[PDB]
């Protein structure tokens, strides 16, 4: 498993843990944002989910972009007219960072329905770079999830996809999920997926690796379990539509468990 980098996985995990704390957005930047709301951010993220589906972008790219947006909005006040330009530049930067074949700038302009010019997008690109001080190699929920997946006895695709889906759902709702770190949402997502599919629970081995227990994960878990139950009703549905696709094993069609016994 050199693909699983056995000589470095622990060093990497430890490092991401440190970086996730340094790249964390301000919990509650929206109260400090005069003209935008969590509702508008949900709309933006859901849109970005559809953009990534359309340009066949990695899941990582979506997660990076959301990170960039939240970090940006943590220090930069933005008018609702401009929120999408931030988002577009975030997704462009994410794509150039993470994708073998990023979509061209023009394609980003096109998906905003000429709301914005090529010149405006590339100028926000620079501004976002300036605000984040090129600090773009951010830990995401997925980077944690993929390592946690290695602890399955044995690997179950349904688990893997369901945990991806739940972690994605959390990107949508700044309240409450801005208050939990990627590593923690990923643990909650993993456990919830594992329990739903196989009945099993957070592995001792992941307690060893992460330090997290069901005790420490419980608050996030209760929030995530709620989001799962109410997801058919949520005003944003792009992620559910996305996760009906066979690519992801149709996991958005699986029934959430009514209780957790936690």
């Amino acid at each position: 498993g050199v693909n699983e980098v056995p000589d470095y996985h622990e060093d990497i995990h430890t490092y991401l843990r440190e970086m996730e704390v340094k790249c964390k957005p301000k919990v509650g930047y929206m109260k400090k944002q005069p003209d935008i709301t969590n509702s508008m951010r949900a709309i933006l993220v859901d849109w970005l989910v559809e953009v990534g589906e359309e340009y066949k972008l990695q899941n990582e790219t979506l997660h990076l972009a959301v990170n960039y947006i939240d970090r940006f909005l943590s220090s930069m006040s933005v008018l609702r007219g401009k929120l999408q330009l931030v988002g577009t530049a975030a997704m462009l930067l994410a794509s150039k960072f993470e994708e073998i074949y990023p979509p061209e700038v023009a394609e980003f302009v096109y998906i905003t329905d000429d709301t914005y010019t090529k010149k405006q997008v590339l100028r926000m690109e620079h501004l976002v770079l300036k605000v984040l001080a090129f600090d773009l190699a951010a830990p995401t929920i997925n980077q944690f999830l993929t390592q946690y997946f290695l602890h399955q006895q044995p690997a179950n695709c349904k688990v893997e996809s369901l945990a991806m889906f739940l972690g994605e759902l959390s990107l949508i709702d700044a309240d409450p999920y801005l208050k939990y770190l990627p590593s923690v949402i990923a643990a909650a997502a993993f456990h919830l997926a594992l329990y739903t599919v196989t009945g099993q629970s957070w592995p001792e081995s992941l307690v060893q690796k992460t330090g997290y227990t069901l005790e420490t994960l419980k608050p996030c878990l209760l929030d995530l379990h709620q989001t799962y139950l109410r997801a058919p009703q949520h005003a944003q549905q792009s992620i559910r539509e996305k996760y009906k696709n066979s690519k992801y094993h149709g996991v958005s069609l699986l029934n959430p468990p009514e209780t957790l016994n936690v």
Binding site: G1, Y8, I100, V105, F134, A137
Partner: protein, 300 residues
């Protein structure tokens, strides 16, 4: 970043990169000699190049004595200057100046050890270099060698996903890439250092192929054509062909005759076919080759 172009004084051109020219420059207030890498964003209709975004973001968190330091980024709206720590020479030029004498074994040993430290640090921080070659390894007057040119580097996840296929200068490129495998990992950087290690001893590239197929054939002719025994899954790989000639593995003492038993051991593990068995930068630091290692200065 505290930087502004007025405090720098250009000295001379020192090379070209993937974004334009590199210049040696002097900080006029501190005295510090730096290397400026200019990116002409003006010629860039697609905004800031992906190569630059990766190089800056990745080198911003790689602080290590054997990785070249990004000191600053000056982001004018017209141009982007990357301010780097300055180093006198690259390992390629030094090998050309050290011909007929050869690099002293102590200096090879020092250099390899340092390269392994820098790379271990890269790998430990989720970064693949993906273009290790002597041109991209910089040396100073104090006997330091440092990984440079992160324009092709990539932040990886665990396990790895499919990344770019066009990776690594051909002569330094690992078989798993040549055979078109869905997945490549940290092992591809070790392969490169493997080639570099041989190259430091012989003063010539170990596998100087002109085409992908010629590169493979040269590797196979030196290390033997791999089968399922030495490298399980090889015969299944996208660009494996059963028609491949089947060369015998040559005795490794004949690949690099001047090299001692410990050197041979180490090199053999760096050039193992199977990426899963290839030695890691971290493990290699403990190799007995390095028992008596010191850090002498370049001798020229």
């Amino acid at each position: 970043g505290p930087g502004s172009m007025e405090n720098f004084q250009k000295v001379e051109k020192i090379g070209e990169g993937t974004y334009g020219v590199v210049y040696k420059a002097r900080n006029k207030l501190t005295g510090e000699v730096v290397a400026l890498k200019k990116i002409r964003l003006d010629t860039e209709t697609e905004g800031v190049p992906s190569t630059a975004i990766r190089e800056i973001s990745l080198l911003k968190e790689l602080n290590h004595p054997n990785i070249v330091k990004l000191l600053d980024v000056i982001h004018t709206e017209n141009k982007l200057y990357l301010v780097f720590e300055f180093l006198h020479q690259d390992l390629k030029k030094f090998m050309d100046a050290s011909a007929l004498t050869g690099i002293p074994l102590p200096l090879i040993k020092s250099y390899l050890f340092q390269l392994l430290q820098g790379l271990a640090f890269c790998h430990s921080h989720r970064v693949l270099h993906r273009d290790l070659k002597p041109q991209n390894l910089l040396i100073n007057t104090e006997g330091a060698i440092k990984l440079a040119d992160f324009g092709l580097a990539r932040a990886f996840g665990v396990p790895v996903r499919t990344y770019t296929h066009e990776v690594v200068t051909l002569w330094y490129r690992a078989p798993e890439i040549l055979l078109g495998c869905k997945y490549y990992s940290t092992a591809v950087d070790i392969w490169s250092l493997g080639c570099i290690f041989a190259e430091m001893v012989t003063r010539r590239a170990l596998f100087p192929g002109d085409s992908e197929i010629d590169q493979l054939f040269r590797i196979f002719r030196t290390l033997g054509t791999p089968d399922e025994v030495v490298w399980p899954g090889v015969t299944s790989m996208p660009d494996y062909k059963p028609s491949f000639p089947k060369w015998a593995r040559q005795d490794f003492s004949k690949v690099v005759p001047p090299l001692d038993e410990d050197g041979r051991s180490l090199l053999s593990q760096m050039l193992h076919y199977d990426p899963n068995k290839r030695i890691s930068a971290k493990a290699a630091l403990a190799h007995p080759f390095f028992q008596d290692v010191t850090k002498p200065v370049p001798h020229l």
